[PDB]
Amino acid sequence: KQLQTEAQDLKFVLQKSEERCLKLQDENSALKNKLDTISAKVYLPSCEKGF
């Protein structure tokens, strides 16, 4: 009965892990947006400090 439970429901747990990875991908997207944004104003000119 428990193995039916092991099967029921890890499809769901797989789905919950999908929600968590999406949460993380979304946060990473926001951070990536910050990197692109910060770079657009910081490095566009600060790249000269570098080079």
């Binding site: 890890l10 499809k11 797989l14 999908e18 999406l22 991908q25 979304d26 990473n28 997207s29 990536k32 990197l35 692109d36 770079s39 490095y43 600060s46 790249c47 570098g50 080079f51």
Partner: protein, 429 residues
């Protein structure tokens, strides 16, 4: 084996497209040898840095060198020491780089999946990449090299950007119905893009580069699968290495499964089984003081039982010349090699090793599967029964943890740690 002195410091190596050059990497230098003249140097490059990646351009003119925590990419011309280029666009990182075939360019991958700016070596032309998913994985070129498929991620979804490699324009962007792209392959005839999803779904998505899905190799939803994949160089047969010790051999003409090649465990259960083992021996004659305590590759049919994560799954599916055999093996058989014979679609020439197998290489234009296992020996599934190339006292302790084998399948590169053996094995053919 005809060969040179052990190359000192050879932490790693690559060989050239035309197989004439071998690049040896030492932590701070690259040595280039012209194997046809002799296994001797033509030049050496040094860097005040740590080299993590080395690559030959597919014309064997430039070496691509990527430096570690220095974010530096250097490209040098073997035939022009006056042409030195470096990519120092470091604010974003230069995490990795690959060569872009005849475009004379480097795809340099920034960190954080930000950009994979393509740096032309003739004019920079630095086109942005819209959030590349990866560095090497997920990046592949069409059979004719005109199209490139890049796994990319935005909208937190995986999709494939199809770029025309001659101008890097996005030409055929499409969404893939994936959970998480692992890699991308192109059909040998470029009639499709074979998209390899995460092992979670066991699936392959076959898309026409011009229209989206053609076919799907069915997922099982809840099992790991698609551990590895390879295409034959015969019209095109794709052998899907699953995670359940099976290969789904698929005729890509129709995208149908030409049964499942299963590794099983019982040799006797394959109707055509032939089983061999590497076994303890004495030397070949007329050997002298070289000592004995050696092995030979012999047939031993009596053997029936053959010996999550890296368990169960097919570790390899390599097609032989003309794809009559598949060099496979599963993670469940740390000490054995499976050779599938097709057209029989039955297992034959099952090889047990003295120690766990590290990898395989089919010879081009032949078979004689090169089997290496960190043993200072090259074992071969010789077509003519069996063969072992004992490695000599030069490098007596050399393990051979990695092997390269030239397309001009005359020259072998054996790598251990800071150490390489470059030679010409029993290759009279």
């Amino acid at each position: 084996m005809q060969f040179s002195n052990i190359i000192q410091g050879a932490c790693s190596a690559i060989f050239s497209q035309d197989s004439s050059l071998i690049a040896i990497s030492n932590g701070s230098k690259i040595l280039i040898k012209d194997i046809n003249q002799e296994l001797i140097n033509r030049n050496v490059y040094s860097f005040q840095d740590i080299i993590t990646h080395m690559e030959f351009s597919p014309d064997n003119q430039l070496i691509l060198v990527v430096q570690s925590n220095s974010n530096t990419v250097e490209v040098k011309n073997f035939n022009d020491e006056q042409w030195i280029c470096k990519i120092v666009d470091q604010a974003c990182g230069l995490l990795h780089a690959v060569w872009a075939p005849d475009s004379r360019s480097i795809i340099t991958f920034s960190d954080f999946q930000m950009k994979a700016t393509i740096y032309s070596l003739t004019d920079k032309q630095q086109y942005l990449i819209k959030n590349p998913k990866y560095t090497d994985k997920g990046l592949s070129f069409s059979s004719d090299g005109k199209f490139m498929a890049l796994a990319e991620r935005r909208d937190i979804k995986d999709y494939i950007g199809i770029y025309y490699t001659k101008d890097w324009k996005l030409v055929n962007h499409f969404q893939v119905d994936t959970m998480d792209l692992v890699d991308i392959q192109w059909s040998k005839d470029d009639g499709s893009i074979l998209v390899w999803d995460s092992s979670i779904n066991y699936k392959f998505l076959v898309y026409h580069p011009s229209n989206g899905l053609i076919q799907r190799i069915q997922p099982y939803e809840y099992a790991l699968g698609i551990k590895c994949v390879e295409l034959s160089n015969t019209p095109n047969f794709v052998a899907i290495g699953s995670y359940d010790e099976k290969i789904r051999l698929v005729n890509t003409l129709t995208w149908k499964i030409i049964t499942e090649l299963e590794h099983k465990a019982n040799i006797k259960e394959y109707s055509n089984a032939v089983v061999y083992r590497e076994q303890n021996s004495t030397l070949l004659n007329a050997q002298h003081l070289v000592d004995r305590t050696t092995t030979q590759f012999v047939i031993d049919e009596s053997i029936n039982k053959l010996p999550k994560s890296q368990q169960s799954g097919v570790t390899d599916v390599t097609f032989s010349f003309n794809a009559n055999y598949i060099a496979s093996k599963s993670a469940s058989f740390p000490n054995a090699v499976f050779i599938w014979e097709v057209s029989l679609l039955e297992l034959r020439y099952i090889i047990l090793l003295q120690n766990p197998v590290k990898g395989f290489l089919w010879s081009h234009n032949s078979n004689n599967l090169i089997i290496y296992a960190g043993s200072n020996k090259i074992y071969f599934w010789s077509l003519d029964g069996a063969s072992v190339c004992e490695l000599p006292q030069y490098g007596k302790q050399f393990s051979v943890n990695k092997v390269l084998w030239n397309k001009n399948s005359k020259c072998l590169v054996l790598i251990d740690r800071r150490d390489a053996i470059i030679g010409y094995p029993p290759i009279d053919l």
